From a paper:
Imp-L2 can bind human IGF-1, IGF-2, insulin, and DILP5 with nM affinities, it counteracts insulin signalling in Drosophila being essential for resistance to starvation, while its overexpression leads to an extension of the lifespan. Here, we report the crystal structures of the Drosophila Imp-L2 protein in its apo-form, and in holo-complexes with insect DILP5 and human IGF-1. The three-dimensional characterisation of the Imp-L2 IBP in its free and hormone-complex forms revealed its fold and hormone-binding mode that are entirely different from, and unrelated to, IGFBP-1-6. The apo-Imp-L2 consists of two, similar, immunoglobulin-(Ig)-like fold domains, each of them with two-sandwiched layers of ~6–7 anti-parallel β-strands.
Author numbering:
A (entry chain B): 1 to 21, 43 to 61
B (entry chain A): 30 to 85, 89 to 239
Write the structure that this text describes.
């Protein structure tokens, strides 16, 4: 659906992963874990 | 794989008011599809072994939120613990709930009457590979029992079809996810006396 909502909801997930365990790109087109990962 | 962590960990202690329903929320993120379950009291650590299926499925990443509703007045402090499992990993967070100093209601008896639905088990984020299948839950606490309806990313209601069905337990099954699928799906849980809703974000990842 909306690019905005995807981005909001994307960062909300990403917030957790990067610390321990671009948004626009992957909200407009499907990315893969490698690219998504380069959020940190 | 394999990893598992909390994203919303419950507070360790709570103070019950007289007559008021507590909802302990625990939320977590991890590889594949984490499973949460709650236990009451002190469980010896050896005791899990309480796992419910150990069946081999995906490279998905899920963020799943489960809540425990206490709707009766405790006559004595009690602990509720939520247990997370996925792959070879297990984690947990415990909360002690403390009874009121004084109470107008009977201890240990469930507040009577109807009750607004509450969605107690739901996925926040569910990322999986293209063409894979995903099954998004919605579980509920409701008296009377609650009807479940789902909407798609465009916010249209979902009806049964070749790629979408809602299962008997309210989970929504989406088959062969395509990029057109990415978005939010909303579970609407409803009864005579009210409603609740939850939102799940589906990101179909590439190759």
């Amino acid at each position: 659906g909306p690019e905005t909502l995807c981005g909001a909801e994307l960062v909300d997930a990403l917030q957790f992963v990067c610390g321990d365990r671009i948004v626009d790109e992957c909200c407009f087109r499907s990315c893969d874990l490698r690219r998504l990962e380069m959020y940190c | 794989a394999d990893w598992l962590k909390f994203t919303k960990t419950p507070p360790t202690k709570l103070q019950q008011a007289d007559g008021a329903t507590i909802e302990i929320v625990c939320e977590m993120m991890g590889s594949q599809v984490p499973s949460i379950q709650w236990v009451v009291g002190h469980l010896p650590r050896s005791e899990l072994d309480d796992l419910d299926s150990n069946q081999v499925a995906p490279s998905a990443i899920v963020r799943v939120r489960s809540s425990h509703i206490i709707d009766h007045v405790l006559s004595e402090a009690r602990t509720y613990t939520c247990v997370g499992r996925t792959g070879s990993k297990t984690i947990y967070a415990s909360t002690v709930v403390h009874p009121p100093r004084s109470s107008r209601l009977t201890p240990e008896k469930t507040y009577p009457g109807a009750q607004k639905p509450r969605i107690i088990y739901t996925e926040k984020t569910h990322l999986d590979l293209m063409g894979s299948n995903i099954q998004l839950p919605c579980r509920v606490h409701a008296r009377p029992r609650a009807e479940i309806t789902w909407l798609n990313n465009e916010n249209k209601e979902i009806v049964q079809g070749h790629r979408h069905r809602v299962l008997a337990n309210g989970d929504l099954l989406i088959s062969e996810i395509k990029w057109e699928d990415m978005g939010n799906y909303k579970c609407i849980a409803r009864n005579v006396v009210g409603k609740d809703t939850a939102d799940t974000f589906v990101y179909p990842v590439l190759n």
